[PDB]
């Protein structure tokens, strides 16, 4: 009378037996990545900066990040099987990515030792897979470090935290509880991994849907700039900045139809697969978009302050695409960078506000090199690239001078979660209470004061560890004094 019952749908975990198996687990990892390094997940560190104010439509969904409600941001989020959101969710999905990747990276290494592959062509492809897993290992730890370890420039902290990283787990080991390792340990790990992969990935990108060597250098360049290694940041950026043309536009309308197209826009270095039936998603947090027949109507929970509008020259293409004058039909601006990609519509006539997961576009590598060059004293290759990017966008920049690098990086990366981290390296306090709201939206976007101030070196620019890992592991040093 045999009575063991196994589930339909699932299979057992086993060591990798055959090339084909390796390749499949490899897609599942790239599949997992699309729901991790995803625009919806960075909308938190976007709202917390000094650019937005909350409208009368919010139902306390954004106000905790926009207004620094520290009593909410301590515990914030969920990561059960019903929801995955907020700070808890950000913490979770990345650790899952490190863990699932650790399993890929190790099992493929094991498959090579046991000589499971068949010919030289499999074994070579295997090794390049292994290198791709190392880039994603690295992406996961750094994306966790950016939000959960203090910048080297912080005042009061919890006794013991000011030089620590994250719980660093380099193997598939879900049954581990340990303490956080040092900053010096994680940063050498992120960085070695990136380098071990660059010696192996081929020089020319093979698909825009898979980690390439061109991605690797652009990522390391991004990380160095956060560290401040302005010298090394520029030298990796150079390796790739010239391989991706900027968008060639004659007016605003021509710009919008290319920037919004994952398949055409020749600035994209790595993105996750997308169709209308797999891999699209709405990202309507910042614009409040909703279809009405074959039109589009707006009701946002945050609109930028007046001064964000004022970075953009009126003839700048981005002052109708990255931001768009669509609030109250035509009286104020909202951040429309994530409006749509029309290739994902179910029916051509009708908007569905679906977009794709983009991982690195070339406009960032330009703004990395300009800023690194300004610090290391290379004004030649620092207006060459700053004017080029500013002009191809419609408004070339007057002076090249780091005060203009700051406004131009802000102009290009709005909605992409870079302003908070930037205003910590540039030693900018919040000043939310002091800015002026858009005068066209009165009665709609009104002034709401802070619930905690954010002068420089305030601990709350870093997020607090989620109370699941605090509660489950009292060997963990938390970050906030409170």
């Amino acid at each position: 009378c045999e009575l063991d019952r196994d589930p339909e749908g699932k299979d057992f975990q086993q060591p990798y037996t055959s090339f084909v198996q390796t390749k499949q687990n490899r897609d599942g990892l790239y599949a997992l990545l699309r729901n991790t390094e995803n625009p919806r997940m960075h909308f938190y560190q976007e709202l917390q900066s000094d650019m937005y104010c909350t409208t009368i439509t919010d139902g306390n969904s954004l106000a905790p990040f926009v207004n620094w409600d520290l009593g909410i941001l301590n515990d914030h989020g969920r990561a059960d099987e019903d929801e995955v959101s907020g700070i808890a969710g950000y913490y979770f999905v990345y650790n899952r990515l490190n863990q699932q990747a650790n399993a890929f990276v190790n099992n493929t290494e094991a498959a090579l030792q046991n000589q499971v592959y068949k010919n030289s062509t499999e074994i070579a492809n295997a090794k390049s897979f292994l290198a791709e897993g190392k880039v994603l290992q690295a992406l996961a730890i750094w994306r966790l470090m950016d939000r959960f370890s203090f910048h080297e420039s912080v005042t009061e902290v919890n006794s013991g935290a000011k030089d620590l990283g994250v719980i660093l787990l380099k193997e598939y080991n879900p049954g581990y509880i340990g303490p956080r390792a040092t900053k010096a340990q994680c940063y050498d790990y992120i960085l070695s991994r990136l380098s071990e992969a660059i010696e192996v990935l081929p020089e020319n990108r093979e698909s825009v849907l898979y980690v390439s060597r061109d991605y690797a250098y652009a990522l390391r360049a991004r990380i160095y700039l956060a560290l401040g290694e302005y010298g090394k940041a520029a030298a990796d950026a150079k390796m790739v900045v010239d391989k991706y043309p900027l968008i060639g536009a004659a007016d605003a309308s021509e710009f919008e139809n290319i920037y919004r197209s994952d398949a055409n826009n020749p600035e994209i270095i790595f993105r996750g697969f997308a169709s209308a039936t797999l891999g699209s998603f709405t990202a309507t947090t910042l614009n409040g978009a909703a279809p009405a027949g074959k039109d589009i109507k707006y009701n946002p929970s945050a609109v930028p302050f007046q001064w964000v509008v004022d970075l953009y020259e009126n003839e700048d293409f981005r002052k109708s695409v990255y931001i768009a004058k669509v609030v109250k039909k035509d009286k104020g601006y909202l951040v429309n960078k994530f409006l749509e990609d029309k290739a994902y519509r179910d029916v051509q006539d009708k908007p569905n506000l679906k977009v794709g997961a983009r991982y690195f576009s070339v406009a960032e590598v330009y703004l990395i090199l300009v800023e690194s060059a300004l610090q290391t004293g290379d004004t030649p290759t620092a207006e060459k690239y700053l004017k080029a990017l500013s002009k191809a966008r419609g408004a070339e920049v007057s002076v090249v001078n780091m005060e203009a690098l700051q406004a131009e990086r802000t102009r290009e990366l709005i909605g992409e979660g870079s302003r908070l981290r930037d205003m910590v390296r540039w030693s900018i306090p919040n000043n939310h209470d002091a800015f002026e709201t858009q005068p066209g939206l009165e009665g709609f976007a009104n002034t709401t004061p802070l619930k905690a101030q954010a002068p420089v070196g305030f601990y709350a620019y870093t997020w607090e560890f989620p109370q699941r890992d605090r509660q489950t592991n009292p060997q963990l040093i938390k970050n906030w004094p409170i």
Partner: protein, 900 residues
């Protein structure tokens, strides 16, 4: 079913009858000693929660094992049956009674027996028919919320609209001038200002009647019984139709049939069979328990009174207006007709048995049965409505199947061997087995009501993927159980089991349990006769049970599909692993005493217990760095120590004029022993509760002090700091400490009355639960000046600390509140569950008429009186947290019975 060592309760047919509700278990509230039942939703689709004695485990389930006529069913099935078919209910609450069962008997069992007609020689035929309505018990929540322009000045003064603005500017046209919205829709373009004002700062509207209604309930029954030589039959047919009081649609209706039969074939063989079945439409309203701008009880309180969802005729409009909206928001009736739903379940239950008695003592008995339930369900998004995102429709069709079949055949050889040496030896086996199934398909792009077949859909980017789910388990158990006699006073009985389950691995599925207990008849031995004391029995038992209700696949190391592209599949890692997962094992010690006085017309029983859960099944929360959420593990232990007592009386005051009374009580104290990863406490994140090895399972917050009359800010006691008691103003995470309440209420039980006269009757059953606390999550919103300022709030925010006003205790406007103790309420209550008033027609009115010979008249009422401690609709509907809740209901019935 019951043993003489153990503790047992029995409810009669009389308590399981009418009660205008699909949830039968609602009738057992405060009706069995140690049977704590609570219904957390006033939805007709709802089924109550039951914990016998204690809460058994921390991960695995604690509801009792439900058994009808020998086969394990489920509260969902039991609701498709007709209660006038139910003969009695037995609650087997210790561990000697539940010693032949084997699945989750750790939580007791609950045994339903269906009517089988008394043999007699004629025939009985009864007819029932009742009608009634559901209303709503609590109105107090909206007795003190700001009115139309009451909260405008609240909003203006806190500058939520504009920095400097006047009350009229804020309405004069900012939102009274979003008639520009209505004039873009052809329907309402020229009915704004005519028949339909959706904003109005004068006559503010009634949001409660806009979102809740008085809903009718109707049922009726016809049933035949009778028998003859050695053969009996019961038979009934009946219908039931209850409609939910929420205007958001909810309802439940069944059409019931039952044919019960048993026959003595000869003096060596005898067989039986009872067959049931129904046809039921259940539709459940499910925006409840979630926070949505204008829906639910949360809506009736928060929606501003200057938003008006009625036409000029006092009738519900198709749509109302907020401010800044794109698309007008549709009301719950018009939403319902733009978004239809129907399910139809086809339930079947067959049960048969065969007894064979070869030689005197042994009684071989084989039993089998089957439970089939195919349900089928359709749902549409109606094409072309003006208030939608697109004007293209869609349709979803699902197809469920559930087929659990059981065998249980025993062989019992009783026989004496003295005159004072009785004995029985019983022993057989069981085999349950289950298979489930779901299928779903979806299609979109429809352009007309008449052309919405599933195969007439758009073809591209409009195609979907099907739905599919598959589930199956099994149980194989062997048992044995002997009873012993010595004279007529001393009883000893001892039993032993062996359970295997498919929910555990191949090297961990078996587990043996055993029971031992005994009874002493102190009246038939040591006191042979008396003048006041009728009966007196002392009994005691101890046994090990077993709990298994988790999930069917929670022990394997599994991989699923995660697809990246459209041209090859991909694999991701899905579940953690645990080869060593096995049974959670409990153990009970029961010591009890029963007695009866006057003339066995004054009875009472008292039992004391200790229930220990060892080798527990926790869904152990894992650290997120691991990458998973949970994994079930044999980890920890727990204790429930308590006592229950029941007693019934008979104060009858005449000779035809009876007066009855009965009461119930239980107190259980919980205590955790071992936890997971070596911890001594573990807070459940975002819940307000904690599992500390300390004592029970209790709330975990920050003790709230008040406000500083000097600064207007908020204060909190600091945990562990005293004055020669410290207060702070900067909320810290480490301001939170185990408060000494407890989530699972500790005192359960009720009491009932009874009376009479010449026919006329009146009966009253009460029930209570004391020591129950809840977090009024709704007050997080209605009681703060820090956010969500679009919403209406409690009148009290009109006294917040300023500088010109300073002698109150509602804090300054600018701050948001925390989940502390201004939200822990005492959700304790006593309910008057039923209140009947029957009148059996005089026997002398059926004189010449040989057609009848029976009649009665009802006038019932359920949940009509409730003792509010809680400040928010219904204190039952919740536990842990009290969200946008679906209140329980009050009913007014009126039945009529015809007997012949």
């Amino acid at each position: 079913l019951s043993t003489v060592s153990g503790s047992v309760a029995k409810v009669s047919s009389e308590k399981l009858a009418e009660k205008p509700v699909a949830n039968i278990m609602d009738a057992l509230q405060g009706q069995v000693a140690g049977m704590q039942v609570m219904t957390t939703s006033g939805d007709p689709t709802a089924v109550a929660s039951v914990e016998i004695h204690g809460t058994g485990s921390l991960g695995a389930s604690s509801a009792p094992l439900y058994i009808v006529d020998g086969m394990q069913t489920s509260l969902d099935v039991v609701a498709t049956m007709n209660p006038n078919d139910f003969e009695s209910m037995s609650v087997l609450k210790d561990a000697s009674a539940t010693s032949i069962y084997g699945a989750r008997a750790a939580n007791g069992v609950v045994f339903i027996q269906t009517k089988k007609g008394k043999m007699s020689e004629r025939g009985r035929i009864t007819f029932n028919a009742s009608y009634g309505i559901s209303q709503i018990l609590n109105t107090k929540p909206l007795d003190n919320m700001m009115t139309g322009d009451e909260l405008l000045d609240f909003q203006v003064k806190a500058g939520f609209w504009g920095n400097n603005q006047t009350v009229q500017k804020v309405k004069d046209m900012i939102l009274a001038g979003a008639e520009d919205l209505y004039g873009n829709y052809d329907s309402l373009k020229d009915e704004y200002g005519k028949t339909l004002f959706p904003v109005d700062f004068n006559h503010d509207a009634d949001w409660l009647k806009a979102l809740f209604k008085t809903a009718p309930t109707s049922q009726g029954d016809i049933s035949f019984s009778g028998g003859s030589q050695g053969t009996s039959y019961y038979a009934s047919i009946g219908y039931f139709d209850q409609e939910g009081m929420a205007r958001e649609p909810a309802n439940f209706k069944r059409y019931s049939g039952r044919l019960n039969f048993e026959s003595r074939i000869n003096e060596w063989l005898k067989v039986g069979a009872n067959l049931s079945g129904a046809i039921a439409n259940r539709r459940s309203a499910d925006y409840f328990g979630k926070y949505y701008m204008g829906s639910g009880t949360f809506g009736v309180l928060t929606m501003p009174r200057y938003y008006n969802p009625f036409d000029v005729n006092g009738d519900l409009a198709d749509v109302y207006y907020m401010y800044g909206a794109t698309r007008p928001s549709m009301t719950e009736p018009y939403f319902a007709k733009m978004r239809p739903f129907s399910s139809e379940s086809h339930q079947a239950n067959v049960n048969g048995f065969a007894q064979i008695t070869p030689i005197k003592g042994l009684t071989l008995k084989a039993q089998a049965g089957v439970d089939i339930t195919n349900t089928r369900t359709s749902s549409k998004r109606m094409p072309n409505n003006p208030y939608d995102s697109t004007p293209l429709g869609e349709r979803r069709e699902r197809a469920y199947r559930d087929v659990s079949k059981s065998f249980t055949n025993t062989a019992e050889y009783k026989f004496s061997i003295d005159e004072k040496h009785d004995l029985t030896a019983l022993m057989g086996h069981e085999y349950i087995e289950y298979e489930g199934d779901v299928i779903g398909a979806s299609s979109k792009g429809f352009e007309s009501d008449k052309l919405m077949l599933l195969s007439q859909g758009k073809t591209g980017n409009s195609l979907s993927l099907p739905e599919h789910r598959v589930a199956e388990y099994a149980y194989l158990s062997f048992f044995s159980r002997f009873n012993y006699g010595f004279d007529k006073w001393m009883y000893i009985d001892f039993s032993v089991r062996n359970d295997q389950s498919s929910r555990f691995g191949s090297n961990n599925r078996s587990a043996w349990f055993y029971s031992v207990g005994g009874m002493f008849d102190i009246y038939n031995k040591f006191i042979q006769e008396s003048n006041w004391l009728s009966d007196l029995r002392l009994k005691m038992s101890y046994g090990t049970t077993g709990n298994s209700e988790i999930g069917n696949y929670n022990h394997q190391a599994l991989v699923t599909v995660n697809n990246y592209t459209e041209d090859a599949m991909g694999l991701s890692i899905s579940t953690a692993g645990n080869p060593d997962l096995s049974w959670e094992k409990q153990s009970q010690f029961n010591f009890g005493l029963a007695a009866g006085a006057f003339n066995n017309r004054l009875s009472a029983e008292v039992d004391f217990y200790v229930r220990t859960t060892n080798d527990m099944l926790i869904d152990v929360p894992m650290p997120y760095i691991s990458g998973f959420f949970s994994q079930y593990q044999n980890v920890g232990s727990m204790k429930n120590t308590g006592v229950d007592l029941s007693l019934k009386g008979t104060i009858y005051q005449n000779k035809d004029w009876n007066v009855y009374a009965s009461a119930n009580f239980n107190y259980n104290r919980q205590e955790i022993t071992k936890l997971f990863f070596g911890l001594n406490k573990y807070m459940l994140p975002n819940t307000g509760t904690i599992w500390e090895i300390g004592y029970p399972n209790s709330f975990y917050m920050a003790e709230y002090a008040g406000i500083d009359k000097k600064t207007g800010k908020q204060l909190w006691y600091v945990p562990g700091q005293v004055d020669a008691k410290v207060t702070t103003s900067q909320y810290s995470a480490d301001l939170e400490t185990r408060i000494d309440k407890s989530v699972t209420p500790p005192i359960t039980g009720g009491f009932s009355l009874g009376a009479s006269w010449k026919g006329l009757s009146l009966d009253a059953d009460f029930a209570y639960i004391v020591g129950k606390w809840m977090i009024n999550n709704d007050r997080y919103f209605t009681e703060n000046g820090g956010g969500l300022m679009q919403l209406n709030k409690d009148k009290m925010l009109l006294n917040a600390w300023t500088e010109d006003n300073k002698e109150t205790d509602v804090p300054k406007l600018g701050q948001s509140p925390q989940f502390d103790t201004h939200l822990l309420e005492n959700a304790s209550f006593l309910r008057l569950k039923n209140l009947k008033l029957t009148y059996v027609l005089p026997n002398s009115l059926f004189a010449g008429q040989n057609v009848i010979g029976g009649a009665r008249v009802y006038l019932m009422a359920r949940n009509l009186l409730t003792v509010t401690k809680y400040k928010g609709f219904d204190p039952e509907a919740g536990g842990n947290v009290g969200k946008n809740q679906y209140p329980n209901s009050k009913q007014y019935v009126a039945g009529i019975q015809l007997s012949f």
